[PDB]
Amino acid sequence: PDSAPGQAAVASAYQRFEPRAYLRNNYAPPRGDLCNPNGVGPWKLRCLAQTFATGEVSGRTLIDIGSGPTVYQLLSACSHFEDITMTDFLEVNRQELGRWLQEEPGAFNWSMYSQHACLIEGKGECWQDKERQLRARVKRVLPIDVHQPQPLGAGSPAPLPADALVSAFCLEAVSPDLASFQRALDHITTLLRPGGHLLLIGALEESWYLAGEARLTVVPVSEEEVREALVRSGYKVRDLRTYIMPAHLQTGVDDVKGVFFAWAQKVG
Amino acid sequence: ASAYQRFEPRAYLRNNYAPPRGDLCNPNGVGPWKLRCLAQTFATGEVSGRTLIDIGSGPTVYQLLSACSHFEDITMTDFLEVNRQELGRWLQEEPGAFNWSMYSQHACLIEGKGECWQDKERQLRARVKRVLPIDVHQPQPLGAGSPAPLPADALVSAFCLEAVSPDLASFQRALDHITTLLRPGGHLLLIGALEESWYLAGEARLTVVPVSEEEVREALVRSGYKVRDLRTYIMPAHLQTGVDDVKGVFFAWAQKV
Ligand SMILES: Nc1ncnc2c1ncn2[C@@H]1O[C@H](CSCC[C@H](N)C(=O)O)[C@@H](O)[C@H]1O
Ligand SMILES: Nc1ncnc2c1ncn2[C@@H]1O[C@H](CSCC[C@H](N)C(=O)O)[C@@H](O)[C@H]1O
Ligand SMILES: Clc1ncnc2[nH]cnc12
Numbered sequence: 001p002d003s004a005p006g007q008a009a010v011a012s013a014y015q016r017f018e019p020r021a022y023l024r025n026n027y028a029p030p031r032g033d034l035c036n037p038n039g040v041g042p043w044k045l046r047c048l049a050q051t052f053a054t055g056e057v058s059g060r061t062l063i064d065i066g067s068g069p070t071v072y073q074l075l076s077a078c079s080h081f082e083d084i085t086m087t088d089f090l091e092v093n094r095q096e097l098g099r100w101l102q103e104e105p106g107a108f109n110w111s112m113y114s115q116h117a118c119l120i121e122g123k124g125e126c127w128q129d130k131e132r133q134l135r136a137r138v139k140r141v142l143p144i145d146v147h148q149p150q151p152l153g154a155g156s157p158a159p160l161p162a163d164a165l166v167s168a169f170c171l172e173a174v175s176p177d178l179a180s181f182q183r184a185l186d187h188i189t190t191l192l193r194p195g196g197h198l199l200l201i202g203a204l205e206e207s208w209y210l211a212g213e214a215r216l217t218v219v220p221v222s223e224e225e226v227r228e229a230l231v232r233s234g235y236k237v238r239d240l241r242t243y244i245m246p247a248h249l250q251t252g253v254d255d256v257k258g259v260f261f262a263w264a265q266k267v268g
Numbered sequence: 269a270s271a272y273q274r275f276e277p278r279a280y281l282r283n284n285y286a287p288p289r290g291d292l293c294n295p296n297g298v299g300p301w302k303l304r305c306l307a308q309t310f311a312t313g314e315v316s317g318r319t320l321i322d323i324g325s326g327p328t329v330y331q332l333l334s335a336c337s338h339f340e341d342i343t344m345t346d347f348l349e350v351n352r353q354e355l356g357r358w359l360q361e362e363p364g365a366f367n368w369s370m371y372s373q374h375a376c377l378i379e380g381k382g383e384c385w386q387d388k389e390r391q392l393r394a395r396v397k398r399v400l401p402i403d404v405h406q407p408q409p410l411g412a413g414s415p416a417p418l419p420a421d422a423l424v425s426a427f428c429l430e431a432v433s434p435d436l437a438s439f440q441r442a443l444d445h446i447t448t449l450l451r452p453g454g455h456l457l458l459i460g461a462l463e464e465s466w467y468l469a470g471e472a473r474l475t476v477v478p479v480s481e482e483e484v485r486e487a488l489v490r491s492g493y494k495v496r497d498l499r500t501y502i503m504p505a506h507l508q509t510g511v512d513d514v515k516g517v518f519f520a521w522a523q524k525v
């Protein structure tokens with residue numbers, strides 16, 4: 001059917017997206033509380049760390065899809081890829097990453113996440129080295145639209161196809177419905193080499209979330225709907241985990257019921 | 269002992285616990301080595317009990333980071349009032365407190381239990397019951413009727429004895445004095461400078477008795493200890509900074525018999 005209308009609503013809504021409110025909502029306490037191991041923050045970092053610790057996810061290049069203003073999702077990844085591409089639809093997010101990349105004071109402070117990543121990776125790495133290395137390995141920050149058949153545009157700067165994809169809380173957060181979600185997943189898959197890996201983190205059964213003035217509409221998906229899409233896009237699912245959001249972390253910034261983590265390998 | 273009246277805690281903290289000696293990122297540095305010695309020792313599970321006294325804490329807390337989860341009642345001590353105030357500022361989260369968070373983070377890193385550094389600090393602050401005056405040159409270092417529970421199940425002392433003693437014999441007596449605070453069977457974790465004769469703390473120029481690993485060992489034996497472990501870190505050139513003339517650092521794990 002028609003994708004333009006729904007997508008247009010999505011683009012319109014996001015023009016009001018406030019990175020600082022989003023950061024506050026999802027990455028400052030209580031959700032940003034890395035001290036409780038039962039919290040969502042540690043669960044996120046744990047999924048990534050353990051996945052990369054298998055040694056099975058490696059290569060030269062990685063593309064992070066819909067990075068927004070966050071970098072936690074690359075902390076464990078950055079030791080396994082020489083070349084990392086970050087991306088976002090919104091200029092204000094790309095600028096936010098720009099501040100962190102220049103190590104400015106005004107930048108969001110990710111050091112708790114960096115340290116925690118060092119803690120659970122168990123190699124006694126200090127967090128300053130971790131951060132220095134991610135900053136070195138991020139080779140570009142690009143505009144992206146996952147609804148386009150070529151999400152990075154034509155003749156993009158990105159090394160293609162990539163050995164690996166990371167995407168956290170993007171697809172479900174920018175797709176009006178499941179069909180759109182599936183197509184988004186189809187589009188980003190054209191960027192991954194056959195046999196490459198996709199690490200997909202996202203919200204389960206979420207219909208809305210706030211980022212300042214902007215209230216955004218999210219397609220609520222289930223674990224089984226996420227599995228089907230991955231199969232439908234040509235992936236073998238290696239791992240699919242579910243975190244049930246505790247009530248004390250359900251804060252009125254959204255209606256998220258849980259979080260999913262998928263490690264999928266593109267068939268070919 | 270009057271020289272210690274000019275001892276500036278911030279200058280000392282700058283000299284030993286800020287970069288380069290303060291950089292914890294390089295595993296071959298003295299900071300990580302010290303934390304490593306403490307952690308490994310406690311990780312054995314052979315150093316346990318209810319009460320612990322830290323001897324000559326100065327204005328530093330790193331020496332108890334790994335210890336605090338093994339002892340519910342902790343006593344910190346120093347000869348100088350200014351050092352006791354500097355400790356108070358960190359314990360009470362006051363303004364101007366020295367930031368020990370790098371060390372707390374590194375202890376959590378080394379200990380490998382998944383603990384966030386804030387929990388670590390929280391526990392340490394909670395278990396430190398009291399900060400007391402002390403003088404190891406006195407037969408009763410803590411004085412007559414101290415608030416400290418005695419005898420302690422364990423002692424810790426870092427860079428104190430050799431730094432307050434003019435010579436080996438004074439060093440030996442100082443050790444005899446603090447040994448009286450320790451329950452028989454108790455454990456002593458002693459960390460200290462090797463072959464050092466002076467160091468600076470702002471306007472203060474302190475004298476140090478230069479001691480060897482073999483001298484340290486013999487002293488512990490003379491005081492009634494069985495040396496369970498004794499290691500040396502040789503101070504690399506890049507950490508020899510004009511603040512002192514230290515050659516190495518010794519770590520000793522001893523058990524009172
Ligand atoms: N059409 C589109 N194509 C690709 N990314 C988009 C998009 N529309 C919005 N986005 C980005 O999708 C993100 C959802 S928030 C996720 C932020 C980050 N990945 C983290 O894990 O929190 C926002 O940064 C938003 O700007
Ligand atoms: N006569 C005495 N008896 C017990 N402690 C003394 C003393 N004279 C000086 N001290 C304290 O011995 C300490 C030596 S340096 C501080 C060592 C600190 N524990 C750390 O590990 O870096 C100083 O705090 C000093 O004030
Ligand atoms: Cl933990 C969580 N829940 C809902 N939305 C999110 N976006 C990023 N993290 C999120």
Ligand SMILES: Clc1ncnc2[nH]cnc12
Pocket residue numbers: 284289298427461464467512514517
């Ligand atoms: Cl590493 C080191 N060297 C000399 N004196 C010291 N006091 C505390 N740490 C010290």
